[PDB]
Design an enzyme around this catalytic site. Structure first.
Site, short mmCIF file in Angstrom:
data_model
loop_
_atom_site.label_atom_id
_atom_site.label_comp_id
_atom_site.label_asym_id
_atom_site.label_seq_id
_atom_site.Cartn_x
_atom_site.Cartn_y
_atom_site.Cartn_z
N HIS A 201 26.47 -9.94 -46.16
CA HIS A 201 25.46 -10.94 -46.47
C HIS A 201 24.25 -11.09 -45.56
CE1 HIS A 201 25.44 -15.19 -47.71
NE2 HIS A 201 24.60 -15.46 -46.68
N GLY A 202 23.15 -11.24 -46.34
CA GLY A 202 22.02 -10.95 -45.66
C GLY A 202 21.38 -12.43 -45.76
N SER A 203 20.73 -12.94 -44.32
CA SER A 203 20.06 -14.04 -44.31
C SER A 203 18.79 -13.79 -43.40
CB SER A 203 21.07 -15.10 -44.04
OG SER A 203 20.38 -16.46 -44.23
N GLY A 210 22.76 -21.24 -36.84
CA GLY A 210 23.84 -22.03 -37.66
C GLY A 210 25.10 -21.30 -38.31
N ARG A 217 28.62 -21.22 -45.13
CA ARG A 217 28.90 -22.44 -45.60
C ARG A 217 28.49 -22.51 -47.08
NH1 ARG A 217 24.64 -24.17 -41.33
NH2 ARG A 217 24.74 -21.79 -41.53
N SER A 243 21.56 -7.04 -50.32
CA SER A 243 21.72 -8.20 -49.47
C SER A 243 20.53 -8.19 -48.46
CB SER A 243 23.23 -8.15 -48.77
OG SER A 243 24.22 -8.72 -49.21
N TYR A 246 17.75 -10.26 -48.92
CA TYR A 246 17.74 -11.55 -48.49
C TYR A 246 17.39 -11.68 -46.78
CZ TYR A 246 18.85 -12.35 -53.24
OH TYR A 246 18.87 -12.28 -54.76
N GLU A 327 28.15 -8.76 -57.67
CA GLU A 327 28.05 -9.87 -56.59
C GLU A 327 29.47 -10.49 -56.45
OE1 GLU A 327 24.60 -11.58 -57.86
OE2 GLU A 327 25.63 -13.18 -58.36
C1 LIG Z 1 23.15 -14.98 -55.36
C2 LIG Z 1 22.50 -14.18 -54.40
C3 LIG Z 1 23.20 -13.05 -53.59
C4 LIG Z 1 24.04 -12.39 -53.92
C5 LIG Z 1 24.64 -11.42 -53.22
C6 LIG Z 1 24.47 -11.51 -51.97
C7 LIG Z 1 23.59 -12.52 -51.32
C8 LIG Z 1 23.15 -12.36 -49.84
N1 LIG Z 1 22.74 -13.45 -49.22
O1 LIG Z 1 23.63 -11.30 -49.38
C9 LIG Z 1 22.89 -13.42 -52.19
C10 LIG Z 1 22.08 -14.46 -52.17
O2 LIG Z 1 21.52 -14.75 -51.04
N2 LIG Z 1 21.79 -15.05 -53.28
C11 LIG Z 1 20.75 -16.16 -53.16
C12 LIG Z 1 21.63 -17.58 -53.59
C13 LIG Z 1 20.72 -18.59 -53.28
N3 LIG Z 1 19.78 -18.58 -54.51
C14 LIG Z 1 19.08 -19.76 -54.43
C15 LIG Z 1 19.00 -20.44 -55.67
C16 LIG Z 1 18.48 -22.02 -55.74
C17 LIG Z 1 19.25 -23.09 -54.82
C18 LIG Z 1 19.06 -22.18 -53.51
C19 LIG Z 1 19.88 -20.87 -53.58
C20 LIG Z 1 18.79 -17.39 -54.16
C21 LIG Z 1 19.64 -15.97 -54.37
#
Ligand SMILES: C[C@@H]1c2cccc(C(N)=O)c2C(=O)N1C1CCN(C2CCCCC2)CC1
Length: 348
Positions: A201-203, A210, A217, A243, A246, A327
Site C-alpha cells: 500500500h503506497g501513500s 494518520g 481506513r 503502489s 501512489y 488489485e
Molecule cells: C485504487 C488504487 C489502488 C490500487 C492498488 C493499490 C493502491 C495503493 N495505494 O497502493 C491504490 C490506490 O491508491 N488507488 C487509488 C484509490 C483512490 N482513488 C481515488 C478515486 C476518487 C475518490 C478518491 C480516491 C485513486 C486511485
C-alpha cells in the site's frame, strides 16, 4: 537526546515535516495565505465533503448549471484556492470532483499530523523526537539489511516492478518492522482465515502520521461513491510499482514511504470490470480485481506463514479485463495487519 536509532529518528522527522505538509497543500492549489496550515479544522473539512457529495449528485443526475455553480462557489468559499492567473475551474465534471475528494482525504491526514505535532509536548525531560515517536502509538524497529527477512522484501521490490511503470527504478533505503498499538489484537480473529497475503500500500509521506496512528481506513459514507472502481475499501497491490505510484514522488522529491500489510483475503470475489460493491456475496471475504499481468504463481513464497507473491510479472491469460495489474480490496479495517514500512528511493 533520543535513544531511538538514527534511521527511526530520521523517519519520525520525515513524517512530521512541516514543509511537506505545506507543499502538499500548495500542490492541491490551496491558498496558504487565506488558509494556513494552522487553520485547517476537522469540522470545516468534513463540511467540504458534503458539498462535493451534493455537486457530484447534481452532475450525475443532470441538475441545473446554477445548482452546480452555487455549490462550486460554496466549496471555494469554504476552502480558499489560488488558481494564480487562470480562471477557477468549476466543479462540473466528475474527474475534477474526484480530484477534490482526494484532496480532502489528504487535508484530513495533514490536520491529524499537524494537531499531533503541536500538542502534548509538556514533558521537558524527554527529547522531542521521542515525544513525537510516542504519538504514533506504533512500535518501530530497523530490520537488519542482511537478514533473510530483508532479503525477501528486497526481492519483492526487485522482481515485481511493472513494465508500463518505467519512469523510475526503485531502491530500498531502509526497512522498518512496525506494530500499531492494538492492531495485533484487532487482527487476531482473521488468523482463522486462509489466503493471508503480504501486499503493498503506497501513500504520500504526509499521510503517515494518520496511517500509523489510526491504521488504514475506509472512506466515510459522506464521501461521493463515484470514483472507487470496486467500492469504498482498502486497496492493495501485488506489483510494488503500482503502489509506489501512489507515493507521489518526483525527481524533485525522490524519497517515499510504502507499506507491506498482511491482508486476510479468504475467499476472493474475483471481478473484471467496475462495480460499486456495498455487500459481498455469500461467504466472500474480499475482492480481487483481476489484471492482465501478475507475479508468476510458481515463485510465491511464505514469510511467517503469509504468502509473498514475489515472482517476476507475467501474463495471466486474462484479457476480458480492464485492469493492467491486479488489485485487492477488503471492506473491514480489521482485516489488515501492517507489517513493514519501507523508505524508498525512486531513481528516475
Ligand atoms: C485504487 C488504487 C489502488 C490500487 C492498488 C493499490 C493502491 C495503493 N495505494 O497502493 C491504490 C490506490 O491508491 N488507488 C487509488 C484509490 C483512490 N482513488 C481515488 C478515486 C476518487 C475518490 C478518491 C480516491 C485513486 C486511485
Amino acid at each position: 537526546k533520543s535513544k531511538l536509532a538514527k534511521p527511526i529518528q530520521d523517519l519520525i522527522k520525515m513524517i512530521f515535516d512541516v514543509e511537506s505538509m505545506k507543499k502538499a497543500m500548495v500542490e492541491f492549489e490551496i491558498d496558504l495565505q487565506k488558509m494556513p496550515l494552522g487553520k485547517l479544522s476537522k469540522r470545516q473539512i468534513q463540511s467540504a465533503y458534503s458539498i462535493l457529495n451534493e455537486v457530484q449528485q447534481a452532475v450525475s443526475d443532470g441538475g441545473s448549471e446554477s445548482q452546480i455553480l452555487d455549490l462550486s462557489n460554496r466549496f471555494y468559499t469554504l476552502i480558499p484556492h489560488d488558481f494564480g492567473m487562470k480562471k477557477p475551474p468549476l466543479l462540473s465534471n466528475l474527474e475534477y470532483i474526484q480530484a477534490k475528494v482526494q484532496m480532502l482525504d489528504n487535508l484530513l491526514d495533514i490536520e491529524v499530523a499537524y494537531s499531533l505535532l503541536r500538542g502534548g509536548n509538556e514533558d521537558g525531560d524527554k527529547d522531542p523526537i521521542d515525544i513525537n515517536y510516542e504519538k504514533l502509538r506504533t512500535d518501530i524497529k530497523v530490520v537488519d539489511k542482511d537478514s533473510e527477512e530483508a532479503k525477501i522484501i528486497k526481492q519483492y521490490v526487485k522482481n515485481t516492478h511493472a513494465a508500463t511503470h518505467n519512469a523510475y527504478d526503485l531502491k530500498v533505503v531502509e526497512i522498518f518492522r512496525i506494530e500499531r498499538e492494538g492492531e495485533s489484537q484487532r487482527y487476531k480473529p482473521f488468523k482463522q482465515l486462509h489466503n493471508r497475503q503480504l501486499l503493498w500500500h503506497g501513500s504520500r509521506t504526509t499521510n503517515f502520521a494518520g496511517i500509523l496512528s489510526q491504521g488504514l481506513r475506509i472512506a466515510p459514507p459522506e464521501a461521493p461513491v463515484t470514483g472507487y472502481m470496486f467500492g469504498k475499501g482498502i486497496y492493495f497491490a501485488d506489483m510494488v510499482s503500482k503502489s509506489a505510484n501512489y507515493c507521489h514522488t518526483s525527481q524533485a522529491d525522490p524519497i517515499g514511504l510504502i507499506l507491506l500489510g498482511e491482508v486476510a483475503l479468504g475467499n476472493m470475489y474475483e471481478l473484471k470490470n467496475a462495480s460499486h460493491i456495498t455487500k459481498l456475496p455469500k461467504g466472500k471475504h474480499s475482492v480481487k480485481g483481476l489484471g492482465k499481468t501478475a507475479p508468476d504463481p510458481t515463485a510465491t513464497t511464505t514469510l511467517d506463514g503469509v504468502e509473498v507473491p514475489l515472482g517476476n510479472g507475467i501474463s495471466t491469460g486474462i484479457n476480458d479485463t480492464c485492469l493492467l495489474y491486479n488489485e485487492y480490496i477488503v471492506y473491514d479495517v480489521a482485516q489488515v495487519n501492517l507489517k513493514y514500512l519501507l523508505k524508498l528511493k525512486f531513481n528516475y
